[PDB]
Amino acid sequence: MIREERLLKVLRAPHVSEKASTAMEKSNTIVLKVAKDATKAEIKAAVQKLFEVEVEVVNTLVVKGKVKRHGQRIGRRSDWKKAYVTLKEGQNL
Amino acid sequence: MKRTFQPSVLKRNRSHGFRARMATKNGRQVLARRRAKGRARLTVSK
Amino acid sequence: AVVKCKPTSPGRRHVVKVVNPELHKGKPFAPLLEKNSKSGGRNNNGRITTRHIGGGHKQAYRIVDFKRNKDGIPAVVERLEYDPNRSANIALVLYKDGERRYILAPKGLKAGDQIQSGVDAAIKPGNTLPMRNIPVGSTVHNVEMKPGKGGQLARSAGTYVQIVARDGAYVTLRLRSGEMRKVEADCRATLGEVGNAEHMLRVLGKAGAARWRGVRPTVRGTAMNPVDHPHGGGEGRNFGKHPVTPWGVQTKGKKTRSNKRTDKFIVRRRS
RNA sequence: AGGACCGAACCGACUAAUGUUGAAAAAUUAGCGGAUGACUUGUGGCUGGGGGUGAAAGGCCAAUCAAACCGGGAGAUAGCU
RNA sequence: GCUCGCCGGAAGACCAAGGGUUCCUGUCCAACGUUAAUCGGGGCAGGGUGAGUCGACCCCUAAGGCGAGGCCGAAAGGCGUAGUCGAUGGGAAACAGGUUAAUAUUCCUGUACUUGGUGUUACUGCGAAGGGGGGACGGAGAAGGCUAUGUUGGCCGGGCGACGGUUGUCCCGGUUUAAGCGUGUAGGCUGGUUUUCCAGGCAAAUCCGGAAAAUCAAGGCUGAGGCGUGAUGACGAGGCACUACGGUGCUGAAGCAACAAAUGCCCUGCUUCCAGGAAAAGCCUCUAAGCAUCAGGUAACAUCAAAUCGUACCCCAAACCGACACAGGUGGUCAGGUAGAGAAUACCAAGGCGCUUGAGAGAACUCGGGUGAAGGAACUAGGCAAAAUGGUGCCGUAACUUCGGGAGAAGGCACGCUGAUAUGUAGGUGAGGUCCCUCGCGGAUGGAGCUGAAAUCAGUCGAAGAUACCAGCUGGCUGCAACUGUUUAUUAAAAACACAGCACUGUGCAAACACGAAAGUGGACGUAUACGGUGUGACGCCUGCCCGGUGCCGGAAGGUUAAU
Ligand SMILES: [Mg+2]
Ligand SMILES: [Mg+2]
Ligand SMILES: [Mg+2]
Ligand SMILES: [Mg+2]
Ligand SMILES: [Mg+2]
Ligand SMILES: [Mg+2]
Ligand SMILES: [Mg+2]
Ligand SMILES: [Mg+2]
Ligand SMILES: [Mg+2]
Ligand SMILES: [Mg+2]
Ligand SMILES: [Mg+2]
Ligand SMILES: [Mg+2]
Ligand SMILES: [Mg+2]
Ligand SMILES: [Mg+2]
Ligand SMILES: [Mg+2]
Ligand SMILES: [Mg+2]
Ligand SMILES: [Mg+2]
Ligand SMILES: [Mg+2]
Ligand SMILES: [Mg+2]
Ligand SMILES: [Mg+2]
Ligand SMILES: [Mg+2]
Ligand SMILES: [Mg+2]
Ligand SMILES: [Mg+2]
Ligand SMILES: [Mg+2]
Ligand SMILES: [Mg+2]
Ligand SMILES: [Mg+2]
Ligand SMILES: [Mg+2]
Ligand SMILES: [Mg+2]
Ligand SMILES: [Mg+2]
Ligand SMILES: [Mg+2]
Ligand SMILES: [Mg+2]
Ligand SMILES: [Mg+2]
Ligand SMILES: [Mg+2]
Ligand SMILES: [Mg+2]
Ligand SMILES: [Mg+2]
Ligand SMILES: [Mg+2]
Ligand SMILES: [Mg+2]
Ligand SMILES: [Mg+2]
Ligand SMILES: [Mg+2]
Ligand SMILES: [Mg+2]
Ligand SMILES: [Mg+2]
Ligand SMILES: [Mg+2]
Ligand SMILES: [Mg+2]
Ligand SMILES: [Mg+2]
Ligand SMILES: [Mg+2]
Ligand SMILES: [Mg+2]
Ligand SMILES: [Mg+2]
Ligand SMILES: [Mg+2]
Ligand SMILES: [Mg+2]
Ligand SMILES: [Mg+2]
Ligand SMILES: [Mg+2]
Ligand SMILES: [Mg+2]
Numbered sequence A: 001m002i003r004e005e006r007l008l009k010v011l012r013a014p015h016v017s018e019k020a021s022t023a024m025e026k027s028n029t030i031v032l033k034v035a036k037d038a039t040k041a042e043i044k045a046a047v048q049k050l051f052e053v054e055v056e057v058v059n060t061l062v063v064k065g066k067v068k069r070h071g072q073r074i075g076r077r078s079d080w081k082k083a084y085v086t087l088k089e090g091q092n093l
Numbered sequence B: 001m002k003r004t005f006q007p008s009v010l011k012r013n014r015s016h017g018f019r020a021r022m023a024t025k026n027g028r029q030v031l032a033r034r035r036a037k038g039r040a041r042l043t044v045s046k
Numbered sequence C: 001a002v003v004k005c006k007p008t009s010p011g012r013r014h015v016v017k018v019v020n021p022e023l024h025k026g027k028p029f030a031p032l033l034e035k036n037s038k039s040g041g042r043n044n045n046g047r048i049t050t051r052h053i054g055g056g057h058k059q060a061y062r063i064v065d066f067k068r069n070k071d072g073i074p075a076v077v078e079r080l081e082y083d084p085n086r087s088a089n090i091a092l093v094l095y096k097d098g099e100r101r102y103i104l105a106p107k108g109l110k111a112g113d114q115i116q117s118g119v120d121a122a123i124k125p126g127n128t129l130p131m132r133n134i135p136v137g138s139t140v141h142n143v144e145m146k147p148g149k150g151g152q153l154a155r156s157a158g159t160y161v162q163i164v165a166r167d168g169a170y171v172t173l174r175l176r177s178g179e180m181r182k183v184e185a186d187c188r189a190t191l192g193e194v195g196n197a198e199h200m201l202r203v204l205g206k207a208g209a210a211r212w213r214g215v216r217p218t219v220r221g222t223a224m225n226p227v228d229h230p231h232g233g234g235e236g237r238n239f240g241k242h243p244v245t246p247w248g249v250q251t252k253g254k255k256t257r258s259n260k261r262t263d264k265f266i267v268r269r270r271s
Numbered sequence D: 001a002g003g004a005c006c007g008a009a010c011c012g013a014c015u016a017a018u019g020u021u022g023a024a025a026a027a028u029u030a031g032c033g034g035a036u037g038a039c040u041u042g043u044g045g046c047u048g049g050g051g052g053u054g055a056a057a058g059g060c061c062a063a064u065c066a067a068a069c070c071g072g073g074a075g076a077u078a079g080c081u
Numbered sequence E: 001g002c003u004c005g006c007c008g009g010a011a012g013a014c015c016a017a018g019g020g021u022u023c024c025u026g027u028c029c030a031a032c033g034u035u036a037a038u039c040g041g042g043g044c045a046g047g048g049u050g051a052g053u054c055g056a057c058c059c060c061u062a063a064g065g066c067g068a069g070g071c072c073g074a075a076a077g078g079c080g081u082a083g084u085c086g087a088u089g090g091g092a093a094a095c096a097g098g099u100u101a102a103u104a105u106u107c108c109u110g111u112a113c114u115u116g117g118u119g120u121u122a123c124u125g126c127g128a129a130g131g132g133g134g135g136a137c138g139g140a141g142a143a144g145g146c147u148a149u150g151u152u153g154g155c156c157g158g159g160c161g162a163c164g165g166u167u168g169u170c171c172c173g174g175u176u177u178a179a180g181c182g183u184g185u186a187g188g189c190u191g192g193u194u195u196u197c198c199a200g201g202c203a204a205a206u207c208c209g210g211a212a213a214a215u216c217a218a219g220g221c222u223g224a225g226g227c228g229u230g231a232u233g234a235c236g237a238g239g240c241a242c243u244a245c246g247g248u249g250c251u252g253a254a255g256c257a258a259c260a261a262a263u264g265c266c267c268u269g270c271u272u273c274c275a276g277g278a279a280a281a282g283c284c285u286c287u288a289a290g291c292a293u294c295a296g297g298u299a300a301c302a303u304c305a306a307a308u309c310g311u312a313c314c315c316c317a318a319a320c321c322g323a324c325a326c327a328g329g330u331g332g333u334c335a336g337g338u339a340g341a342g343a344a345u346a347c348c349a350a351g352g353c354g355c356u357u358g359a360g361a362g363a364a365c366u367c368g369g370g371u372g373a374a375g376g377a378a379c380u381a382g383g384c385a386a387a388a389u390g391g392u393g394c395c396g397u398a399a400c401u402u403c404g405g406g407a408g409a410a411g412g413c414a415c416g417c418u419g420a421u422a423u424g425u426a427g428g429u430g431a432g433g434u435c436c437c438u439c440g441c442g443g444a445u446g447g448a449g450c451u452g453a454a455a456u457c458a459g460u461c462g463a464a465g466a467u468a469c470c471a472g473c474u475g476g477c478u479g480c481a482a483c484u485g486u487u488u489a490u491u492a493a494a495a496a497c498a499c500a501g502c503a504c505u506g507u508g509c510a511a512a513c514a515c516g517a518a519a520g521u522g523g524a525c526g527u528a529u530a531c532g533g534u535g536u537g538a539c540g541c542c543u544g545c546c547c548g549g550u551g552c553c554g555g556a557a558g559g560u561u562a563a564u
Helices: A004-010 A018-025 A040-051 B009-015 B018-022 B025-036 C207-211
Strands: A011-014 A029-034 A057-063 A080-086 C002-004 C016-018 C075-082 C089-095 C100-104 C139-141 C161-165 C170-174 C180-184 C266-268
Touching (some): A004 A040, A029 A040, A040 A080, C075 C100
Antiparallel strands (some): C139 C161
């Protein structure tokens, strides 16, 4: 499971937005870009160890990259995993 | 009026799919040709 | 029983039913059934190999004791049943050690009858036993054709065979066809005629009738075009052919048997 | 009870007009037949080109079929224009 | 923003398939949009899809596909065993409310349920790839009990009328509440427990099956809905405050009854018929190899677990199939009011729209409609097209017939409203009360209230009461086909094909026949009352003569005759 090698590689970025931000006030939830493969399990562990905060539960979803055809030839941004992580009640960083 | 192309992904991947070409001599022979032409798109996929 | 229907509607007016009140109502006996899948007439290449077959009612197959091996153990007929797979009816028969089997219902069989098999069994309707021990002259159905194999001759509604001469180690049967055939005397066989025989008195009466028995229409070659069938096209009702099978072989006459291997066993062809 | 009657859905396609560089490479509008049956329909399967399937019209087999489409023999041959 | 009109079994809403960001916000207008466009499904940038219990994966199998070995085939390869795959079908569990610009049975609030691991504890025979059960099955029709839903009343909040009247028998609105848990109802099926023994269930069985007794009759299984809880709650007009005027916060009445009532549910029922109506796992049980103070098995409690992938948006369409923002095509689900038999139809509700060039003119002619003096098929190939008929009840109805039909033959009469019988009838429904009792969702009694056609008598308005939409024209002679069906997708729907019925002819089963160099397979898990081929085409009365020719069958003494 740890694989702290793995635990370090699982978390990529915070993800900013209106939604992501009310989700932190209103529902003590934090929103991150995590590895594509990452499990809710793996995501839980990581957030605990690295962000030192207790973790109520983890939700995930997969985001489909948008496409942007510029004349004949087309391109595709890639798919990433989003993680809505709730933070118990001991709400800190 | 009802036209001749009524799509269905399962039926697609089944009759013209990659593995369907890998199944048989002449289907594999297709794949070769397309590779000889250097085709960007061997089969149709996800 | 055979019933005529009143003409409340054409294609009904001509209907002649065959309704047998001593027939079990509802489902058969579950454990003696199995799948049976329809075939459209088509073999394992996808090609219709036999014309005119398809649709019509779904059918479960009842396993049926064609060999009749349970020697010694008596059994009673529990009930008579309709079997959608044959023109005959069948008997649900309960053996004295608790085993159950289906058999072809012979002519008179009722619920609460004893039947039995083995070389000894009473010469009575329902009883099976090798032919060496059956009185020459008896009328007999469901006749084995090799010892131990199982029923092959006289299986259809209203049919029978009659042993007309033992001699040798073979018998000589008058088959319902009219043919007279030899067959070894250790071939098992059953006393009786096979059951219901008002069968032939049905009339169907309308088209859907045959349809729901899985019979699709037959197209007369004379209504086809020459590319299809040897019976040409015409130009408003012509014939002028010597009548043939769609594959250019003669109907109306030509003998088509050919065996030699079994030629020995035939004593008189039918007529 | 019924391949029963009338009539929507549903399946069909008898008549007329409109349309005919169409709203449409077969339809619109008014009328029309079947509508518990040989009815109708979704999903998947099977049959392959002198081959399939055909309640038989030479119908249908991807806007086509008296022998599909694709590639090859191939620059077939053309005493014809 | 106010009005007007249109759809409303859809032109509303939700899925599936299919699309693949079209979803939401900002911003821009070249090109795309049949016009302009500041707008857009267009450009650009950003945001957006949150699940143990929705679906998929998964377990299981259908048709069918693949298929170690194998069988067959010049090579390629074809078939096929064990097996292994394959949903369109079987298999555990979640609901109401709230919320976002855009997700929600996934987030939040409330309240649950499933099945595994661990643990503790009490209690116990546990134990398959096997046996048994079960899962597990068609069509039609019948009517009862329900619910979804609706109408009225009551109840609550609000109203007192732009113009004669409106404090009342007046007006308007609302009156909503899930799973889960408890109760076992209307109603469906079946008699139970015990003991003994047995050629069956590939071995075994306490199970199933079979045979015997003994014994008590009430026993069990299934099961809509109701009621209760869930709900101290949610929701609820409206208030009251704030407001960037978009909204936000706070608060919050009544929240019942009667009657009507599906096509939904009881119902995988019941009755009934002939064409006789999948499989396998899950699940219950039985034991075998086994393991026997173990492991297990059942239960309570606690506890952990339930991964991964899908979820935006279009959906009978501007996002799919049609080259188009195309009058076409596309499976499933939901069903409000009045009139109505109705899912027709007309008008409305909820909701969605006015179809992406418009402005004027009021010519011919064309397309689509309305009315038409007198005549009434004189038109025309032909009544093509129009016009006409059109409902319900009662009366009434020819030839002919296979006695069913013909038949809605034809042809009449009635039809609105108001009063009376009866201030609302017959019918339906059914509360209080009285009594009974195995007292329950019970039985008998009782008729309040509610709802409610139809008929006659009398009166009355109009030219007209089936007043609109809607909705057969009728009759006579004759050809052909018995009939329902099928067919030329796109100029032929017919007398053509089919058909039930009839006949001939092949076929003894390793059937004939058919697909196959072959293996293998259909015919068929059939067996001559069966299967194939050919012609005929219900049925009534019938179906004569000809075997020279040509086909076929039988035959044979001769003659002629191949390889050798
Ligand atoms: Mg997910
Ligand atoms: Mg025929
Ligand atoms: Mg026939
Ligand atoms: Mg023809
Ligand atoms: Mg030929
Ligand atoms: Mg002629
Ligand atoms: Mg009918
Ligand atoms: Mg009709
Ligand atoms: Mg036509
Ligand atoms: Mg039409
Ligand atoms: Mg298909
Ligand atoms: Mg075509
Ligand atoms: Mg050719
Ligand atoms: Mg070519
Ligand atoms: Mg050449
Ligand atoms: Mg050339
Ligand atoms: Mg406006
Ligand atoms: Mg785009
Ligand atoms: Mg423009
Ligand atoms: Mg938009
Ligand atoms: Mg855009
Ligand atoms: Mg959660
Ligand atoms: Mg092999
Ligand atoms: Mg194979
Ligand atoms: Mg599987
Ligand atoms: Mg499925
Ligand atoms: Mg939405
Ligand atoms: Mg435990
Ligand atoms: Mg089993
Ligand atoms: Mg109700
Ligand atoms: Mg006034
Ligand atoms: Mg959605
Ligand atoms: Mg729509
Ligand atoms: Mg448009
Ligand atoms: Mg369109
Ligand atoms: Mg309508
Ligand atoms: Mg406009
Ligand atoms: Mg007129
Ligand atoms: Mg006139
Ligand atoms: Mg006049
Ligand atoms: Mg006149
Ligand atoms: Mg004239
Ligand atoms: Mg004239
Ligand atoms: Mg006309
Ligand atoms: Mg008219
Ligand atoms: Mg004439
Ligand atoms: Mg006809
Ligand atoms: Mg017809
Ligand atoms: Mg045509
Ligand atoms: Mg026959
Ligand atoms: Mg004929
Ligand atoms: Mg004759």
